[PDB]
């Protein structure tokens, strides 16, 4: 129920949203995972440009 | 940046510039006084009248 | 100096309180070298603490 001058706001949480919560504890490990692969590729494409 | 550049308000407040432009310190402490009566105390009545 | 002692460090006997040492210290490879430096800068009483 609206109390006073508020914003007529509509949250999109009427579905079973808690099942499909994508958390980002992967992020710092992912940035290392991508970086390790980027290095290992650059050393493979040996005298060639790293960026492609 | 600094909000104030001289942080020492020991030296600022006893600088000749500030000390010149104050009033006199009212350091004397005035406690409450008893109400003596007209007919009880004669020389309280001699002070008022 | 006052803040570092209020933080709790035993710097009573430290030389200067921005304790800047030579770049010979970055050449060190053993702890016996690292110990002797902190004895001579008199930071060791903080390691002892």
């Amino acid at each position: 129920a609206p109390s006073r001058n508020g914003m007529i706001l509509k949250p999109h949480f009427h579905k079973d949203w808690q099942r499909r919560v994508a958390t980002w504890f992967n992020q710092p490990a992912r940035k290392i995972r991508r970086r390790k692969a980027r290095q290992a590729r650059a050393r493979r494409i040996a005298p060639r440009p790293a960026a492609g | 940046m600094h909000k104030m550049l001289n942080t020492d308000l020991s030296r600022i407040l006893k600088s000749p510039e500030i000390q010149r432009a104050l009033r006199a310190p009212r350091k004397k402490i005035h406690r409450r006084v008893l109400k003596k009566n007209p007919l009880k105390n004669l020389r309280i009545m001699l002070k008022l009248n | 100096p006052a803040l570092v002692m209020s933080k709790g460090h035993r710097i009573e006997e430290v030389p200067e309180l921005p304790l800047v040492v030579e770049d010979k210290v970055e050449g060190y490879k053993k702890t016996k070298e690292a110990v002797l430096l902190l004895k001579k800068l008199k930071a060791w009483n903080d390691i002892k603490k």
């Binding site: - | - | 030389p15 200067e16 040492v21 030579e22 210290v25």
Partner: protein, 34 residues
Amino acid sequence: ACARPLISVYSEKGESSGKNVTLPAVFKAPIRPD
């Protein structure tokens, strides 16, 4: 203040070397524990 004193540099034996660094303006930044 805005003065920057002449910071000595100490030899590995704990005694003063000849060299002096000027105290960086970093060390005269406002002390805000907040």
